[PDB]
Amino acid sequence: YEAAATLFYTPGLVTKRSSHVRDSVDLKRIMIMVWLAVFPAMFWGMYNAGGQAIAALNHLYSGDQLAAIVAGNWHYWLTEMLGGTMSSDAGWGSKMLLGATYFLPIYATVFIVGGFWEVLFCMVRKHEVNEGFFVTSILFALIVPPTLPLWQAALGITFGVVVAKEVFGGTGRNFLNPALAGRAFLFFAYPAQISGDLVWTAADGYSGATALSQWAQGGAGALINNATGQTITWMDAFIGNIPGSIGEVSTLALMIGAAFIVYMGIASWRIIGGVMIGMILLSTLFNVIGSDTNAMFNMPWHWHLVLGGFAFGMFFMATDPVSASFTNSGKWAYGILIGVMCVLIRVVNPAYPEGMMLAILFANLFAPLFDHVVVERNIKRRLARYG
């Protein structure tokens, strides 16, 4: 097919102007490299979702009740039919399969719908379909609960692709993060399906809070995994043995993935360092101030790091080149703002337990203003006749 050749082969073009040689890098390689960097996180997310679901199911039901429950859910009985099991002694293969039967439909729906919208816009406007939608779609599929309805996923990706990206002219022309825009659409449109105690573990009839929610309730002594009766530890949160969004849990896997794109020069270590600085500063300030009624005041920076979607956002969503600042000096301020806002929304906003996407969307509005300040200083320096 025509699309096959234009995606697998290279254009075979030559140059036409004064720079007769060009760099090897291109947007296609950049986007595919970013797309490959989240594979460890995706695989661990599938495995973890399966494990959490099986543990909760066996904690709740047993025997004939468990048999009836599995017979009544296509995820469960498809896992069983394909050679896996749903017993307590299920292996990593069975857990990965159970997580796949949740992740793959969401990803396929998102990809198909967003691709339809992208192709429609590019064909009508007579552009060339380009990459980056790969990154958008995979990130959006990874930042949602395992139980999200497919029609809601379709609406979210539609909003993110059309309203935030395509209406501004496409890739490189917008100013806002498309995946986070779609996630915010879902957040404020159907909050019952993307919050609470009923959406973060794919076990029927199971209700359970996660670490950020439990800390806000009772400090560090409230971090208990009720499915298994054990206490969530820092190593558990770091490895990713906790409930939550699909691909956010494993800080280790996210770090491994992000190291490559940072080394390759695609992600901004300046942005990452700014985010870390802001987080550490505000968290330590809250710790020093203290509080007798808010348990979030005494959560240290190293606990802030491994909970929620902080690492995922910092490594893969705060580093979107288009939405960030275009100046080296402005990148530090952009990252510091993102980190400060995340910690602030976590601590002093009681409505939401996490604030990464809100913080990033807030900083997207002010990045160009940091650029303006820096460029104005540069222009003044030039007028002083010092270049």
Ligand X SMILES: Cc1cc2nc3c(=O)[nH]c(=O)nc-3n(C[C@H](O)[C@H](O)[C@H](O)COP(=O)(O)O)c2cc1C
Residues from 30 through 89 that contact ligand X (CB under 6 A): none
Residue nearest to ligand X according to CB distances in the complex: 309
Q: Which is nearer to another protein, 280 or 375 (CB)?
A: 375
Residue pair 296/345 in contact (Cβ under 8 Å)? The answer is no
- Does 382 contact another protein by CB under 8 A? yes
Residue 214 CB contacts under 8 Å (≥ 6 apart), including other chains: 222, 223, 224
* Pairwise CA distance, residues 140 & 148, whole Å: 12
Give the x/- contact pattern for ligand X in 235-274, rule: CB under 6 A: ---------xx--x--------------------------
Q: Which is nearer to ligand X, 183 or 331 (CB)?
A: 183
Q: Which residue has the tokens 């990148």?
A: 331
Q: Which amino acid, residue 162?
A: V
C-alpha distance from residue 289 to each of 284, 294, 298, 305, 347 (Å)? 9, 11, 9, 20, 13
* Pairwise CA distance, residues 286 & 96, whole Å: 39
Residue 80 CA from chain centroid, whole number: 30
Q: Which is nearer to ligand X, 6 or 207 (CB)?
A: 207
Tokens of 127: 């552009």
Q: Which does 318 bind (CB under 5 to 8 A by kind): ligand X, another protein, none?
A: none
Residue pair 245/305 in contact (Cβ under 8 Å)? The answer is no
Q: Which amino acid, residue 160?
A: G
**Number of residues engaging another protein in binding (CB under 8 A):** 92
- Does 198 contact another protein by CB under 8 A? yes
Residue 366 CB contacts under 8 Å (≥ 6 apart), including other chains: 334, 337
Q: Which does 322 bind (CB under 5 to 8 A by kind): ligand X, another protein, none?
A: another protein
**Number of residues engaging ligand X in binding (CB under 6 A):** 29
Tokens of 331: 């990148």
Give the x/- contact pattern for ligand X in 141-180, rule: CB under 6 A: --x-------------------------------------
Minimum CB separation of residue 94 from another protein in Å reads: 29
Strand partners, 247: none
- Of the residues 182, 313, 330, 339, which one makes contact with ligand X according to CB under 6 A: 313
Q: Which does 379 bind (CB under 5 to 8 A by kind): another protein, ligand X, none?
A: another protein
- Does 197 contact ligand X by CB under 6 A? yes
Q: Which residues bind ligand X (CB under 6 A)?
A: 143, 187-188, 191, 195-197, 200, 209-213, 244-245, 248, 308-309, 312-313, 317, 351-358
